[PDB]
């Protein structure tokens, strides 16, 4: 079973598992815990947003690692932005509190 890029759950946008579904294994929560036990910050981040669910992020990453762009514009992936839109639609204004 092998997967660099394949199909992701159109509902979940997270990758599948196995070469049959063209997905890698599940980072689950135990693998996440082990990753923290090591502490691969940007790696866990990419695995969590880019490698996990960055859809338009995937398109850009293709265009960018197309340029071999082995970096990222990180932080508060975008799920943060989605939750922000949701809370604002709930009439809960929030502030990106810069210190």
User: In the bound complex, what is the minimum distance in angstroms from residue 19's beta carbon to other proteins?
Assistant: 7
- Restricting to residues 13-72, name those near other proteins by CB under 8 A: 14-19, 23-49, 51-52, 56, 58-60, 62-63, 65-72
Closest CA to 28 of 1, 62, 52, 61: 52
Counting contacts by CB under 8 A, is residue 95 touching other proteins?
yes
User: Mapping DSSP to helix (H, G, I), strand (E, B) and coil, where does residue 98 land?
Assistant: coil
Counting contacts by CB under 8 A, is residue 11 touching other proteins?
no
Counting contacts by CB under 8 A, is residue 10 touching other proteins?
no
DSSP label of 57: H
């Amino acid at each position: 079973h092998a997967r660099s890029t394949g199909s992701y759950s159109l509902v979940t946008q997270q990758p599948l598992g196995g070469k049959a579904q063209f997905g890698g294994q599940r980072f689950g929560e135990m693998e996440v815990w082990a990753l923290e036990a090591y502490g691969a910050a940007y790696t866990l981040q990419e695995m969590l947003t880019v490698k996990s669910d960055d859809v338009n992020g995937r398109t850009k990453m293709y265009k960018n690692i197309v340029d071999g762009n082995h970096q990222m514009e990180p932080g508060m992936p975008e799920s943060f932005n989605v939750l922000l839109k949701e809370i604002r639609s709930l009439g809960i204004n929030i502030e990106l509190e810069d210190e």
